[PDB]
Short mmCIF file of C-alpha atoms and ligand atoms in Angstrom, two decimals:
data_model
loop_
_atom_site.label_atom_id
_atom_site.label_comp_id
_atom_site.label_asym_id
_atom_site.label_seq_id
_atom_site.Cartn_x
_atom_site.Cartn_y
_atom_site.Cartn_z
CA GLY A 1 35.95 11.72 88.03
CA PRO A 2 35.71 7.95 86.56
CA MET A 3 32.81 8.74 84.13
CA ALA A 4 34.66 11.64 82.90
CA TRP A 5 37.87 9.77 82.62
CA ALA A 6 36.16 6.62 80.58
CA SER A 7 34.23 9.39 78.18
CA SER A 8 37.62 11.18 77.20
CA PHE A 9 39.16 8.14 76.44
CA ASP A 10 36.34 6.87 74.51
CA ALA A 11 35.88 10.24 72.74
CA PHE A 12 39.66 10.62 71.89
CA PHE A 13 39.69 7.22 70.17
CA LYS A 14 36.73 7.88 68.03
CA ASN A 15 38.70 10.32 66.22
CA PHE A 16 41.05 7.95 64.31
CA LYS A 17 40.58 6.18 61.31
CA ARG A 18 39.76 2.37 61.72
CA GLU A 19 42.92 0.74 60.18
CA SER A 20 44.88 3.30 62.18
CA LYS A 21 44.05 2.48 65.68
CA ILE A 22 46.40 0.60 67.76
CA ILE A 23 44.30 -0.87 70.23
CA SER A 24 41.04 -3.12 69.74
CA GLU A 25 37.53 -2.16 70.16
CA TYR A 26 37.57 -4.79 73.00
CA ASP A 27 40.86 -3.45 74.35
CA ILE A 28 38.72 0.13 74.71
CA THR A 29 35.54 -1.68 75.74
CA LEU A 30 37.42 -3.48 78.80
CA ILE A 31 39.46 -0.20 79.44
CA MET A 32 36.11 1.69 79.84
CA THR A 33 34.83 -1.46 81.77
CA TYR A 34 37.45 -1.01 84.38
CA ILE A 35 37.35 2.89 84.67
CA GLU A 36 33.58 2.80 85.12
CA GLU A 37 33.45 0.04 87.65
CA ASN A 38 36.57 2.06 89.71
CA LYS A 39 38.75 -0.99 88.98
CA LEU A 40 41.61 1.63 88.47
CA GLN A 41 44.30 -0.57 89.20
CA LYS A 42 43.13 -2.99 86.58
CA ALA A 43 42.45 -0.34 83.77
CA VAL A 44 46.24 0.78 84.30
CA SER A 45 47.26 -3.09 84.26
CA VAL A 46 45.59 -3.53 80.68
CA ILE A 47 47.04 -0.23 79.46
CA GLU A 48 50.60 -1.02 80.45
CA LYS A 49 50.35 -4.61 78.59
CA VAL A 50 49.27 -3.06 75.77
CA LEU A 51 52.27 -0.66 75.71
CA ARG A 52 54.54 -3.71 76.16
CA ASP A 53 53.05 -5.40 73.30
CA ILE A 54 53.00 -2.35 70.98
CA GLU A 55 56.67 -1.36 71.95
CA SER A 56 57.98 -4.90 72.03
CA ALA A 57 56.03 -5.94 68.45
CA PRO A 58 58.03 -7.67 65.82
CA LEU A 59 57.21 -7.28 62.10
CA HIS A 60 58.47 -9.93 59.77
CA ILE A 61 57.25 -9.59 56.26
CA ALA A 62 57.67 -12.32 53.49
CA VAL A 63 57.92 -11.57 50.04
CA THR A 64 57.85 -14.35 47.54
CA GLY A 65 57.92 -14.24 43.63
CA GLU A 66 59.89 -15.52 40.74
CA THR A 67 62.98 -13.61 39.52
CA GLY A 68 62.69 -10.65 37.43
CA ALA A 69 59.46 -9.54 39.41
CA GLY A 70 61.37 -6.11 41.10
CA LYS A 71 61.26 -8.50 44.50
CA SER A 72 64.54 -6.73 45.52
CA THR A 73 63.65 -3.09 44.10
CA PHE A 74 60.16 -3.66 46.31
CA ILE A 75 62.26 -4.96 49.44
CA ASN A 76 64.23 -2.21 49.15
CA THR A 77 61.50 0.57 48.62
CA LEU A 78 59.79 -1.12 51.76
CA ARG A 79 62.76 -0.31 53.86
CA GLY A 80 63.61 3.30 52.40
CA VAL A 81 67.08 1.89 51.14
CA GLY A 82 68.68 3.10 48.14
CA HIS A 83 70.03 0.11 45.44
CA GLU A 84 73.56 1.52 46.54
CA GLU A 85 73.79 1.42 50.08
CA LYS A 86 74.66 -1.24 52.74
CA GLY A 87 71.93 -3.66 53.39
CA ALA A 88 70.10 -3.36 50.08
CA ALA A 89 68.94 -6.11 48.24
CA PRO A 90 70.83 -7.35 44.91
CA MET A 91 67.82 -21.34 47.16
CA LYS A 92 67.23 -20.24 50.90
CA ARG A 93 65.31 -17.47 52.35
CA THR A 94 67.59 -14.32 52.97
CA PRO A 95 66.51 -11.53 56.13
CA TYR A 96 66.62 -7.65 55.35
CA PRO A 97 66.52 -5.87 58.33
CA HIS A 98 64.82 -2.52 58.33
CA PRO A 99 67.73 0.29 58.54
CA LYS A 100 65.87 2.36 61.59
CA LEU A 101 63.55 -0.13 63.38
CA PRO A 102 65.37 -3.21 65.03
CA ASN A 103 61.97 -5.45 65.10
CA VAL A 104 61.40 -5.18 61.51
CA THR A 105 62.64 -7.70 59.02
CA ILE A 106 61.66 -8.04 55.54
CA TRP A 107 62.47 -11.45 54.10
CA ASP A 108 63.35 -12.36 50.53
CA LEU A 109 62.02 -15.91 49.70
CA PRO A 110 62.54 -18.10 46.24
CA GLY A 111 59.99 -18.24 44.22
CA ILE A 112 57.87 -21.65 44.66
CA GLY A 113 58.56 -22.26 40.65
CA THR A 114 62.12 -22.31 41.38
CA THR A 115 61.95 -25.14 43.96
CA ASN A 116 60.31 -28.57 43.71
CA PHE A 117 58.04 -28.18 46.67
CA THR A 118 54.43 -28.46 46.91
CA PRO A 119 52.55 -25.36 48.65
CA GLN A 120 52.40 -26.99 51.88
CA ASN A 121 56.08 -28.34 51.91
CA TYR A 122 57.27 -24.73 50.70
CA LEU A 123 55.38 -22.80 53.61
CA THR A 124 57.16 -25.07 56.07
CA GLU A 125 60.50 -25.06 54.52
CA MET A 126 60.52 -21.40 54.44
CA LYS A 127 59.29 -21.12 57.86
CA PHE A 128 55.57 -19.68 57.41
CA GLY A 129 54.72 -19.25 61.15
CA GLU A 130 57.65 -16.37 61.65
CA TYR A 131 55.81 -13.89 59.34
CA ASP A 132 53.16 -11.51 59.86
CA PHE A 133 52.12 -11.98 56.16
CA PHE A 134 53.05 -13.00 52.66
CA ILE A 135 53.46 -10.41 49.69
CA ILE A 136 53.44 -12.62 46.25
CA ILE A 137 55.01 -10.63 43.58
CA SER A 138 54.68 -10.72 39.71
CA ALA A 139 55.69 -8.16 37.11
CA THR A 140 53.53 -10.22 34.47
CA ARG A 141 50.65 -12.51 35.19
CA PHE A 142 50.53 -14.79 38.32
CA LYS A 143 51.09 -18.48 37.69
CA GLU A 144 48.65 -21.23 39.26
CA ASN A 145 51.76 -22.20 41.52
CA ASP A 146 50.97 -18.78 43.05
CA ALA A 147 47.21 -19.38 43.43
CA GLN A 148 47.77 -22.50 45.09
CA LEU A 149 50.56 -20.93 47.39
CA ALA A 150 47.87 -18.47 48.54
CA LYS A 151 45.32 -21.36 49.10
CA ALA A 152 47.85 -22.88 51.11
CA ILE A 153 48.65 -19.64 53.16
CA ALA A 154 44.94 -19.19 53.61
CA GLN A 155 44.28 -22.76 54.73
CA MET A 156 46.84 -22.03 57.58
CA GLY A 157 44.80 -18.70 58.80
CA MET A 158 47.67 -15.94 57.47
CA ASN A 159 46.94 -13.01 54.90
CA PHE A 160 48.56 -12.76 51.40
CA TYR A 161 48.69 -10.11 49.07
CA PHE A 162 48.86 -10.17 45.01
CA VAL A 163 51.46 -7.31 44.07
CA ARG A 164 51.61 -6.93 40.53
CA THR A 165 54.63 -4.75 39.88
CA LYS A 166 56.34 -2.50 36.96
CA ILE A 167 52.93 -0.88 36.28
CA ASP A 168 54.42 2.25 35.29
CA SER A 169 56.62 0.47 32.56
CA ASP A 170 53.51 -0.93 30.54
CA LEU A 171 51.53 2.21 30.85
CA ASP A 172 54.65 3.90 29.27
CA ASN A 173 55.04 1.45 26.53
CA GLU A 174 51.08 1.71 25.97
CA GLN A 175 51.15 5.46 25.66
CA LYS A 176 54.10 5.52 23.14
CA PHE A 177 52.44 2.66 21.27
CA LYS A 178 48.94 4.84 21.09
CA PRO A 179 49.38 8.27 21.76
CA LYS A 180 46.06 9.29 20.35
CA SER A 181 43.67 6.79 22.21
CA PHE A 182 45.89 5.96 25.28
CA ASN A 183 43.46 5.39 28.32
CA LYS A 184 45.38 4.76 31.66
CA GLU A 185 42.19 3.41 33.72
CA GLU A 186 41.41 0.50 30.62
CA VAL A 187 45.00 -0.70 30.85
CA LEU A 188 45.04 -0.73 34.72
CA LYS A 189 41.54 -2.54 34.87
CA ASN A 190 42.56 -5.09 31.91
CA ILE A 191 45.83 -6.20 33.95
CA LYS A 192 44.08 -6.28 37.31
CA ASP A 193 41.18 -8.16 35.66
CA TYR A 194 43.29 -10.68 33.94
CA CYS A 195 45.52 -11.40 37.04
CA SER A 196 42.32 -11.34 39.24
CA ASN A 197 40.15 -13.54 37.18
CA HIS A 198 42.95 -16.20 36.66
CA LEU A 199 43.84 -16.58 40.23
CA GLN A 200 39.97 -16.95 41.02
CA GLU A 201 40.23 -20.17 39.20
CA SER A 202 41.71 -21.53 42.19
CA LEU A 203 40.52 -19.21 45.29
CA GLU A 204 38.31 -12.81 45.14
CA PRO A 205 41.80 -12.23 45.75
CA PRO A 206 42.99 -8.57 46.56
CA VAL A 207 45.47 -7.49 43.99
CA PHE A 208 47.55 -4.24 43.83
CA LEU A 209 48.88 -2.87 40.70
CA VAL A 210 52.36 -1.03 41.69
CA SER A 211 55.33 1.20 40.62
CA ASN A 212 58.37 -0.19 42.68
CA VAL A 213 60.15 3.32 41.80
CA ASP A 214 57.37 5.49 43.16
CA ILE A 215 55.40 4.25 46.34
CA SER A 216 53.11 7.34 45.91
CA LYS A 217 51.61 6.11 42.66
CA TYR A 218 48.85 3.29 41.64
CA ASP A 219 47.59 1.09 44.05
CA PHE A 220 50.87 1.57 46.56
CA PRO A 221 48.63 3.64 48.96
CA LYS A 222 45.66 1.49 49.05
CA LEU A 223 48.09 -1.18 49.75
CA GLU A 224 49.43 0.45 52.71
CA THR A 225 46.00 1.09 53.87
CA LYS A 226 44.92 -2.79 53.70
CA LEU A 227 47.94 -3.86 55.59
CA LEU A 228 47.43 -2.00 58.24
CA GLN A 229 43.42 -2.93 58.13
CA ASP A 230 44.48 -6.45 58.40
CA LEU A 231 47.23 -6.33 61.02
CA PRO A 232 46.55 -6.87 64.56
CA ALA A 233 45.59 -3.46 66.24
CA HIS A 234 48.94 -3.75 68.47
CA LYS A 235 51.17 -4.37 65.45
CA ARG A 236 49.81 -1.13 63.32
CA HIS A 237 52.21 1.00 65.57
CA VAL A 238 55.47 -0.82 64.14
CA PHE A 239 54.18 -0.99 60.66
CA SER A 240 53.23 2.54 60.60
CA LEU A 241 56.60 3.90 61.61
CA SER A 242 58.17 1.15 58.94
CA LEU A 243 56.52 3.35 56.37
CA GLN A 244 58.28 5.87 54.35
CA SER A 245 57.52 9.62 54.96
CA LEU A 246 56.87 10.27 51.11
CA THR A 247 52.93 10.87 51.20
CA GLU A 248 50.50 13.06 53.26
CA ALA A 249 48.52 9.54 53.91
CA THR A 250 51.57 7.67 55.33
CA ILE A 251 53.02 11.04 57.30
CA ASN A 252 49.34 11.18 58.86
CA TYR A 253 49.31 7.61 59.70
CA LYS A 254 52.61 7.90 61.79
CA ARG A 255 51.18 11.13 63.09
CA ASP A 256 47.89 9.19 64.43
CA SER A 257 49.75 6.16 65.69
CA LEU A 258 52.11 8.00 67.76
CA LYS A 259 49.46 10.37 69.14
CA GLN A 260 47.43 7.43 70.32
CA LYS A 261 50.58 5.98 71.68
CA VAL A 262 51.54 9.13 73.89
CA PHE A 263 47.85 9.61 75.05
CA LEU A 264 48.01 5.92 76.49
CA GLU A 265 51.23 6.54 78.12
CA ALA A 266 49.43 9.72 79.80
CA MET A 267 46.30 7.27 80.75
CA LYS A 268 48.92 5.10 82.24
CA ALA A 269 50.52 8.03 84.28
CA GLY A 270 47.15 8.87 85.56
CA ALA A 271 44.39 11.74 85.01
CA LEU A 272 44.79 14.93 86.84
CA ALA A 273 42.11 17.12 88.45
CA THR A 274 43.56 20.47 87.79
CA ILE A 275 45.85 21.73 84.62
CA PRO A 276 49.38 21.25 85.31
CA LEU A 277 51.51 24.26 86.32
CA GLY A 278 54.25 25.63 84.08
CA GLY A 279 56.71 26.70 86.24
CA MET A 280 59.14 23.92 85.10
CA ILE A 281 58.46 23.74 81.53
CA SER A 282 61.83 24.16 80.59
CA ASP A 283 62.72 21.16 82.84
CA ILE A 284 60.06 18.91 81.13
CA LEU A 285 61.41 20.01 77.68
CA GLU A 286 64.91 19.00 78.77
CA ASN A 287 63.58 15.48 79.58
CA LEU A 288 61.87 15.27 76.38
CA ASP A 289 64.92 15.87 74.16
CA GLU A 290 65.54 12.65 73.53
CA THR A 291 61.86 11.94 72.66
CA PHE A 292 61.49 14.99 70.25
CA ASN A 293 64.89 13.78 68.29
CA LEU A 294 63.40 10.44 67.93
CA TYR A 295 60.26 12.24 66.44
CA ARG A 296 61.96 14.16 64.26
CA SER A 297 63.68 10.95 62.96
CA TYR A 298 60.45 9.49 62.30
CA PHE A 299 59.52 12.29 59.99
CA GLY A 300 62.64 12.66 58.19
CA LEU A 301 63.25 15.98 60.03
CA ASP A 302 66.50 15.04 61.48
CA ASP A 303 69.52 17.33 60.36
CA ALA A 304 70.57 14.62 57.99
CA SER A 305 67.55 14.02 56.34
CA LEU A 306 66.93 17.92 55.68
CA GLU A 307 70.35 17.92 53.74
CA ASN A 308 68.74 16.38 50.61
CA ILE A 309 65.69 18.76 50.72
CA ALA A 310 67.68 21.77 51.19
CA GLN A 311 70.07 21.01 48.12
CA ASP A 312 67.12 20.48 45.80
CA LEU A 313 65.71 23.80 46.70
CA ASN A 314 69.42 24.95 46.24
CA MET A 315 69.52 26.54 49.79
CA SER A 316 71.21 25.91 52.94
CA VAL A 317 69.40 23.54 55.39
CA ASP A 318 69.53 26.77 57.77
CA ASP A 319 67.67 28.93 55.26
CA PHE A 320 65.32 26.26 54.72
CA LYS A 321 64.37 25.66 58.77
CA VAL A 322 63.34 29.44 58.95
CA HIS A 323 60.42 28.37 57.30
CA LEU A 324 59.69 25.25 59.37
CA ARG A 325 57.80 25.20 62.56
CA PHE A 326 59.39 23.01 64.86
CA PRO A 327 62.63 24.67 65.31
CA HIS A 328 60.88 27.35 67.41
CA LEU A 329 57.77 25.84 68.43
CA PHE A 330 58.58 26.32 72.20
CA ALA A 331 60.49 29.83 71.72
CA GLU A 332 58.31 32.63 72.63
CA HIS A 333 56.96 34.50 70.11
CA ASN A 334 54.79 37.97 69.99
CA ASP A 335 55.99 38.78 73.58
CA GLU A 336 53.29 35.99 74.63
CA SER A 337 54.75 33.80 77.34
CA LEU A 338 54.98 29.71 76.63
CA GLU A 339 53.26 28.94 79.74
CA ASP A 340 50.41 31.29 78.81
CA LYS A 341 50.06 29.76 75.44
CA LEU A 342 50.44 26.33 76.78
CA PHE A 343 47.34 26.93 79.18
CA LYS A 344 45.34 28.02 76.43
CA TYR A 345 46.13 24.99 74.65
CA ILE A 346 45.25 22.38 77.25
CA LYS A 347 41.78 24.04 77.65
CA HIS A 348 41.40 23.44 74.02
CA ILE A 349 42.51 19.81 73.60
CA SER A 350 40.66 19.00 76.88
CA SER A 351 37.24 20.13 75.70
CA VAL A 352 37.42 18.81 72.45
CA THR A 353 37.09 15.04 73.89
CA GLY A 354 35.27 16.55 77.06
CA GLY A 355 32.79 18.92 76.14
CA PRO A 356 31.29 22.07 78.15
CA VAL A 357 29.38 20.48 80.78
CA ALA A 358 31.42 17.21 82.38
CA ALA A 359 34.13 17.41 84.43
CA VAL A 360 37.49 17.91 82.51
CA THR A 361 39.90 15.26 82.53
CA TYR A 362 43.62 16.61 82.25
CA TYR A 363 46.98 14.68 82.01
CA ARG A 364 50.75 15.84 82.72
CA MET A 365 52.44 18.50 80.65
CA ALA A 366 54.56 16.22 79.28
CA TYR A 367 51.49 14.70 77.20
CA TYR A 368 50.48 18.06 75.91
CA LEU A 369 54.17 18.93 74.53
CA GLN A 370 54.70 15.61 73.19
CA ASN A 371 51.26 16.06 71.46
CA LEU A 372 52.12 19.34 69.91
CA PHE A 373 55.35 18.43 68.91
CA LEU A 374 53.87 15.34 66.86
CA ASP A 375 51.33 17.71 65.13
CA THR A 376 53.96 20.24 64.21
CA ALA A 377 56.81 17.77 62.97
CA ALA A 378 53.82 16.07 61.05
CA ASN A 379 52.62 19.45 59.48
CA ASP A 380 56.21 19.96 58.49
CA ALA A 381 56.99 16.69 56.88
CA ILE A 382 53.72 17.42 54.59
CA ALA A 383 54.77 20.90 53.80
CA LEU A 384 58.40 19.14 52.56
CA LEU A 385 56.54 17.02 50.25
CA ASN A 386 55.48 20.16 48.23
CA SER A 387 58.20 22.79 48.96
CA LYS A 388 58.91 23.98 46.03
CA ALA A 389 55.32 25.39 45.04
CA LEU A 390 54.55 26.24 48.68
CA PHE A 391 57.91 28.79 48.86
CA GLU A 392 56.80 30.67 45.70
CA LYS A 393 53.69 32.09 47.40
CA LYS A 394 53.44 31.43 51.24
CA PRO A 395 56.90 32.92 56.75
CA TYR A 396 55.89 29.20 57.50
CA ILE A 397 55.46 26.68 54.84
CA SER A 398 53.41 24.39 56.92
CA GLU A 399 50.18 24.49 58.41
CA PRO A 400 49.86 25.23 62.29
CA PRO A 401 49.54 22.45 64.71
CA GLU A 402 45.59 22.03 65.58
CA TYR A 403 44.83 24.41 68.52
CA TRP A 404 48.25 26.09 69.10
CA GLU A 405 47.52 29.28 67.41
CA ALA A 406 44.42 31.44 68.11
N1 GTP B 501 59.88 1.61 36.17
C1 GTP B 501 59.91 0.38 36.92
N2 GTP B 501 61.30 -0.26 37.31
C2 GTP B 501 61.45 -1.13 38.23
C3 GTP B 501 60.49 -1.57 39.10
N3 GTP B 501 60.82 -2.57 39.61
C4 GTP B 501 62.17 -3.09 39.51
N4 GTP B 501 62.37 -2.01 38.63
C5 GTP B 501 64.02 -1.81 37.87
O1 GTP B 501 64.45 -3.05 37.48
C6 GTP B 501 65.67 -3.10 37.66
C7 GTP B 501 65.69 -4.57 38.37
O2 GTP B 501 64.72 -5.61 37.78
P1 GTP B 501 64.38 -7.07 38.19
O3 GTP B 501 66.02 -7.93 38.22
O4 GTP B 501 63.51 -7.46 37.69
O5 GTP B 501 64.06 -6.82 39.77
P2 GTP B 501 64.84 -6.74 41.09
O6 GTP B 501 64.43 -5.57 41.68
O7 GTP B 501 66.34 -6.85 40.85
O8 GTP B 501 64.63 -8.15 41.83
P3 GTP B 501 64.57 -9.63 41.19
O9 GTP B 501 63.12 -10.19 41.03
O10 GTP B 501 65.01 -10.42 41.99
O11 GTP B 501 65.22 -9.63 39.63
C8 GTP B 501 66.14 -2.12 38.43
O12 GTP B 501 66.82 -1.26 37.47
C9 GTP B 501 64.89 -1.45 38.71
O13 GTP B 501 64.87 -0.16 39.35
C10 GTP B 501 59.01 -0.94 38.57
O14 GTP B 501 58.13 -1.28 38.88
N5 GTP B 501 58.95 -0.13 37.87
#
């Protein structure tokens, strides 16, 4: 009933990292209020409007800094674009669209130094209101011009982040200079402290030390997390989708964002009192074909993406796929029927956010099929990060999706 529905909605969202939740805690409170008050149409109306906002949300990122700071490489790295390809970044602001997400654009802004504007006049010239946040980039030490731009951005109620690039080169130079006494943490601390302490003379700012050529190292993961934390809840979905599938943390940000979105879609469609039947499963899988291929694209599991990984393993994409779970997820194994496996899965998924006493809330079969595919795709993408080492020891290289096996 309504109280079971509200509690299982609450239980579902409690399982996610704060920076990953695609609805706000007020959104949750209002949906729970309406459900508990039997205002079901109002609750569905909130969910519909939340989903429309999530699906239409644009993401506009301004990247500013002087020349030689790695700005073009950073803009390309953000988008997953090779330095060679069409749309790669090599006066006036220049847009760089995301290659795979229409609503996402990274803007190359000329450094305020190379102009003669005040901070406030710089912001108005570059059209400050179009952006969700600003990245201020340097490969050295940030000039007072940048502390003043940040102060101007902040006084306008927007977010900025100082990003110090080329940290890998400075570490490499120090290790070669002082191989007996090299202390990576001391170098990083000395660089961060200098930037932080000098920027503060005009502001303590978040400073992130990064290598533009490896988004998995140094402070780049902490930067992605902070950017997620600071965005409005509804924009975290498009931001998560824009990330590279290059770390476990980023794959899981995508996995968690998509799982929340399909749960909200399930809510909008309506709770069910009984487990959905399986007589039509092949037909539901067929209706979901386009969606499953979209999910494969999000996680880098489409056939074209698998080409790169299969060659580096010196094997065919086909032999590679043998050891991934998503290709035969829905195919019978061990002479167990798919609908009997799905029935056990649904009882597991529903007792997690439901417990053993309250009435159990079920959703349409398509919800469980999408949820299962997302966990499988994400687990396959994670295994891809470490496929060489996994291949040597362990028939699938990936972990099974939660609750599917028994
Ligand atoms: N090791 C390392 N190389 C980098 C990094 N950032 C950029 N590069 C390299 O530096 C070269 C380009 O240098 P820059 O001209 O200073 O930066 P850019 O990417 O061209 O962008 P601009 O700021 O407009 O000059 C390319 O070879 C990049 O591969 C970094 O963080 N680490």
